[PDB]
Amino acid sequence: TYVISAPKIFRVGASENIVIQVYGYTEAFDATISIKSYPDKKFSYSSGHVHLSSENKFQNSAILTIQPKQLPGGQNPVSYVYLEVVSKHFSKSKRMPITYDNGFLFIHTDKPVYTPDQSVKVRVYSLNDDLKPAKRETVLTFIDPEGSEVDMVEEIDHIGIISFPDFKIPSNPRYGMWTIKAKYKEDFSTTGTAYFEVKEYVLPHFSVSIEPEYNFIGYKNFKNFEITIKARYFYNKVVTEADVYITFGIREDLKDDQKEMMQTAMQNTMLINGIAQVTFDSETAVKELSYYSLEDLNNKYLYIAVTVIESTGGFSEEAEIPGIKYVLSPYKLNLVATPLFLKPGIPYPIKVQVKDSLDQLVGGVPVTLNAQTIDVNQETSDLDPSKSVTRVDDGVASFVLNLPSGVTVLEFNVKTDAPDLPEENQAREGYRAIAYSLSQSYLYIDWTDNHKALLVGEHLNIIVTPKSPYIDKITHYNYLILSKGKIIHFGTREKFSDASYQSINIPVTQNMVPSSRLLVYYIVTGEQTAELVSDSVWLNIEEKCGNQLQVHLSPDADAYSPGQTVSLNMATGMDSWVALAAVDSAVYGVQRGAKKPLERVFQFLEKSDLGCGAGGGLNNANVFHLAGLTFLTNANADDSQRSYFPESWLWEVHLVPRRKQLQFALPDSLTTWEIQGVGISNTGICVADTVKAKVFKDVFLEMNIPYSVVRGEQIQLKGTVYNYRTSGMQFCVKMSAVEGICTSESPVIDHQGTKSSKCVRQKVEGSSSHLVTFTVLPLEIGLHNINFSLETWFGKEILVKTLRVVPEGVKRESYSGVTLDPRGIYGTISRRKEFPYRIPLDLVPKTEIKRILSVKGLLVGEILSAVLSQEGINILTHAEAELMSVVPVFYVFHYLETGNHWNIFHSDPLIEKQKLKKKLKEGMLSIMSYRNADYSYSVWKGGSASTWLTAFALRVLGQVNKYVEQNQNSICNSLLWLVENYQLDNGSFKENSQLPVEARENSLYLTAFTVIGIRKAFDICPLVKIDTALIKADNFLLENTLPAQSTFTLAISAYALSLGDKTHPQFRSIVSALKREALVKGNPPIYRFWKDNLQHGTARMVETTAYALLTSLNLKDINYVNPVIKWLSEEQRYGGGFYSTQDTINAIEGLTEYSLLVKQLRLSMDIDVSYKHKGALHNYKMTDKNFLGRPVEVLLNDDLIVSTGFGSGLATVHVTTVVHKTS
C-alpha cells in the first residue's frame, strides 16, 4: 500500500506538509522522505524524517520546504522536483511539477483618479502562503496606458507593509487606464497587477445613480420600459429638487462611443425627494430614429445619457449606461458549486444559476429540467421533471433528484420557463454527470454545503458510507482536510459494525476561512491486489478575521462639525500593524461606478487552490488531480494528463496593540470621508469595514470652479449656498480676487484685498438655496487663490478656492531623439548629443516651453551559449598542411582573449598565454616560410601562384595584427601585387594555380574571398589604390549578385559586402534575399540555417551557414543570430566541415563575434545630462537591474546637452517639446 498523499504543485519557500500512511503491522518501522533536484545523482534540497508507532496508528506528516538551491541561470530554472521515500519495506520515486507561485501581492492605492502634478501614495501588501508577512524585497514598475514603461522603484520590506515613495506625474501626462505591476525582483513569481486612471476629479457635485427596473429590456419591456434615475448627495442626503434631462441613443457595440440618437427626447423631468422615474417606450424610438421598427432587426446596445441640473442653483452632473441590447436568445445558464457527477442511491442536489448577457446573475426566472435515469445493464425510463424559481438574493436555483442504486450516468436539460419567452427562443443547456471502480466500492460525503456556509469554532459532523465494500471488515477510516493547496490536518477513525454509516466530527480552524477541501479515502486488502476509493466535496464557509480588527471613532454622532478634533480607536485580538487610509466618498468618478478600492481579500486569496471544481469525479487518480493532489501508492498510479481640502489624507502605518487609539483633526469638507484600514499579523490579513465619517455643516457655500479655464475668456462661475435651518435668513456673499483678475466692482471696499460686491440681502426659505454668480476673466497663469466671503446669520465663514488656467493652443512635438552608442556599435560613435533650444514664431505671449527627458533601455542580448573546448589538448602541437595545422591556433587564441575565460583549466592563465604566444610565433615563422620571392603565397614549393591561399594568409596576418606585430611594408606590396595582377577591370578576381554559369560562380566566389582578405588586411595598410580596388570589387559584387545562383555564393558575397559598406541598397536587397533563402525549424524558429543544394564529410552547408552568421553579426541582430548559434552548437554536422579549416575558423570567428556582441550589451552607461552654459540638471546611472529612467522636467530655457562617459551597452534617450502655440 504505502499511500503517500501530497499536493499536486509545490510552492518554493513554503512549508508543504507531506503525509504518509501504512497498511499496519505489529512492528513499528521509521520512514524518511527527501527533496531532490533533477540530478539524482547528485543533489538534495531537504530531508525530513517521521516516526511511526501504534499511538500514531502508522501515519505521520512532516513539513517540507523548497529553498533557492536551484542552479543559477541555465535554460530552465525550475527542474521542478524529484520526490523519494526512504522506508524499510518500500522505496519509490516520482517527479512532480512545482511553481515559484508563492504568496500574494495586494497593491493598495489611495485614489483611483489622479490629476497632473499630483503625488502617488501607494503601498504593497506582501504575504506568504501561511498568511505571514513574509518580509521580502519588491520592485514596482509603472506602465503608460499606451503600453510603454515609465519608472521603476525598489525598496526593502522591514515591517510587512511595503511603503513606496510618492510618484510624480510627468509634465505631459497620457490620459487613460494606467498599469501597475510589482515583482520581488530576484527570484519569485505571482506578479500583482493594479489599475488606476488619470482624469479630472476636480468636483463631483452630486452622485447620479441609474437603477432601471429591469436589467435588460425583454419582450414585456419592449412596449413599456420604466427606468429610475436617482441623484443623491455625497453626505448621505438625497437631493431635494433638480431638473433632470434624459437623452437616449442606440449603439452597435460598447467600443463605439459616438452614434446617432434621437432627436426626439430630450425629456424634461423633475427630481423629487432624490428619486425620479420616467416611462420610455421603445416603439417610438425604433420607429422614428432607428429607421426600422422591429425588435428582431436591432441587436445592439442602447445608450442612455442623463443630465441633472439643479433649479435652485447652477450645477450639472452626468451619468451614463453602457448599453442594453435586444437579443433574441434568452439569458444563458451555467452551473456553480455543482459537481457534474453522480452518486448511486443518494439524492444528488442540482444547483443551477442564470446569468444575463454581461456577467450578472438574474433572479425571478422559473426554470425546469428533464432528466433520464439510465440503468447500468439494460433499458431506461424517464424521470419526472421538476420546476422551480430562482431567488433574487441567492441567485442560484436549488434542485434535488433521487436516483436508484443501479444508475451509471444522468443527463439533464435545464430550460427556462417564462410567459414572454417563446419555445423557439428559449435557453437550454444539456449536461452529463458520470458516477465514480474495479472493486465496486464507493464513498460519499453529504450535506453539499447547503447549511449554509458555516463559521469558525463550531464542530461539524459529516456522514460517510462505504457502500458495497470489498470486504465487510474495514481496517480504519482515513480523511484529509486541505486548504490553499496544503494539508492543514489529517484525520483518522475506526470502523465498527454498529451501523452502516458513521458520522465523523471535524473541528474547524481559523486558517480555513476563505475556502477548504476534504477527501476521504479508505484502503482494503485484496486477495491478489488492493484498490482504494476516494471522494471529495467543496467546503464553503463564512469569512471571519483572525485578528478581529475593527475601527471606530470615540465621538459617537451622526454628523461631525468641520475641524472638530476626533479620535480613532483600533481594537484587535493580537498585535498587528495597521495601514489607515481616509479616502473621500466623492473621489469615485462615474468611471462605470468606480467600484471599490479592493473589495476582495478572500476572493483573490482563493486563487491559491490548485484544483478546480467542487469535488468528486472519476477513479482515484482523476478525482485527486481535480482536487489538486498527487498520490503515491502500490495499487494505483496518477496520470498528469492647500486647505480646504484636497484628497486623500491619513496615509500612515502604526503599531496596534490589543487596544490602540490615536488623535488627529478632521478636515473641512462637505463630503463624507470613508476611512479604511488593513491589518497585518502572524494570524493573517484582514481589511476593516469602511466606516463613513460624515462631516456636515448647517450653512456652507460651494461653487463649480471649472477646470482648464482658457485665459482671455470670461466664465459664468455659477454657485449656490445651501440653507438647512428651519427658519429663513438673509445672506450676503462677496468675492475677493488676487492680482490680477478683471472684476466688475470698480472699486473695492474697503481694503485693497477685500472686494465688496454690494450685496443685497435676499431671503432664503427653509431647506432651499439661492443662485450666486460672478463674472471674472483670468489674466495670468495659474494657480491663483480667490477668496469667497459669506456674511450670513448664525455665524459666518470664508472659503478659499484655487483656480487653474490653460493657454489657448496646445501643440505637442517630440522633434528630437537619439540612441547613445558608447563603443560605436551601430555606425559611428555617438556619446555626446546637443539638443538646441528653439522658440517658434507661433509662441503664445507669456508661455514657457516645457521639455521632458527620459531613457528606456532598449534591450539586452541573450546568453544562449559560448562553447569551445578540447582544441588545446587534442591539436596544439601533435608537409604542406602545416598552415592548416597552425592557422586555427590564432582563432582559438582570439576567442580566448575575447571571451576572457581562462579559469576553466587548473593551470595558471599566464603559462597558457605564454605557450599560445610561442605557438603564434611558430605559426608566424611558418607563414613567413610560405612567402615566395615575388611576395606571393603558394602551397607546394612555390611552383604556381594561388590567390585563395594568399587571401587566407592575409586573413591570418590581419588576425595577428591585433595582438603582437606585423610588418606593414610586407603587406602593402603583397596587396598591391594582387591589385595589379589578379584584379580584373570589371572587379572580378581569379587565381593562377588550377555548365557555363559555374565559371561565373567560381569567379564570384574568388572575388568575395579576395574582398574578405583585402578588407581584413586594409585596416593596417590604408592606401588610395587599395580603396579603389575595394570600390571596384564592391561594385562588381553588387552588380553580379542580382540573380539567385547559389546559397554559398550568395552568403560569401553578402559577408564580403558586409565587411565593407553595410547600408548599401543592393547590399540590403542581397541580405533580404538571403533571409528569404534561409531555412528554419519551428514556430518560432529555434534553429536557422542555409542549404546550398535545393531538394537534395557530407555536411557542406556549414560553410554557408557560417558565412550568413558572420553577415548577421555584422548587422548586430541578436534575435536573428541566436537560432544560427543554436544550430552551430549542436546539429547533424558531427562534423562535418570543409576545407578544413575554411569553415572551422569561420565558425570560431562567428562564436567570437557573438561573445563580443553579448559583452557589448552590458548597459553600464552613465548618463549625465547638463546645460550648455549652466549647471547640470540630472544624472542617470544605468545598470542591468535598473534599465529605465525617471522623466525630468526642463523648465529653465537653455541648450540641453546629454552626454556620457565611456560606458558599455546600448540605450536611447527620448526628449519631447511641449509648447503652447496659437491657435
Next chain:
Amino acid sequence: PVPPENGFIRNEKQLYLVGEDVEISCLTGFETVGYQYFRCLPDGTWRQ
C-alpha cells in the same frame, strides 16, 4: 511596420511588443532629419 522612403529599419524582427520603440535610420546616401522613432501603439497601427 511599413518604413518610410529608403526604409532601412534596424533590428528587424517579426513581431514587436506593445510599447517598444524602434529607431529608423536613412539609407545611404541620406540623413535623418526630425523625429525618427516608431512606437508600438496598443492596436496594430503605428505612430509614424
